[PDB]
């Protein structure tokens, strides 16, 4: 137990994947679909309304106009009324 044989140095065994990978951990590209055609969406953009069923609530960090997750949509009859008494319908 005094000695520690089999030092087993690791050099190119970790370089073999690439050198910038051992300084920066790289990024994950999304999966490409077919019905989506060629619109390569990323993981930090959403310009359409989503559905909030058993999903997570997204967060925003700066600028970059985004869509939303619809929680309630309803149509009723538009009653006549303003912020006052002027209610002419002639």
């Amino acid at each position: 137990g005094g000695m520690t044989g089999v030092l087993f140095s690791l050099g190119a065994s970790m370089v073999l994947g690439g050198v910038a990978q051992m300084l920066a951990p790289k990024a994950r590209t999304p999966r490409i679909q077919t019905t989506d055609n060629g619109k390569q969406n990323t993981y930090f953009s959403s310009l359409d309304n989503m559905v909030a069923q058993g999903n997570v609530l997204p967060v925003l960090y700066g600028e970059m106009r985004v869509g939303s997750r619809v929680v309630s949509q309803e149509i009723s009859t538009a009653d006549e009324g303003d912020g006052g008494q002027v209610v002419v319908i002639g």
């Binding site: 949509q73 309803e74 149509i75 009723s76 009859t77």
Partner: protein, 49 residues
């Protein structure tokens, strides 16, 4: 013409017209699926419907 009731998502209006026959039965004259609240019928004949 009518009003829009309580609604989820979106709605369309389906309207059909029936004409009472001479013996007592019914005759269907056309049908329409629309989105506008107001509809107009033109060139109608016979009596009650």
């Amino acid at each position: 013409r009518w009003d829009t009731p309580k609604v989820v998502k979106g709605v369309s209006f389906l309207l059909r017209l029936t004409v009472t026959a001479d013996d007592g039965s019914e005759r269907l004259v056309s049908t329409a699926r629309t989105t506008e609240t107001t509809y107009r019928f033109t060139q109608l004949a016979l009596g009650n419907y």
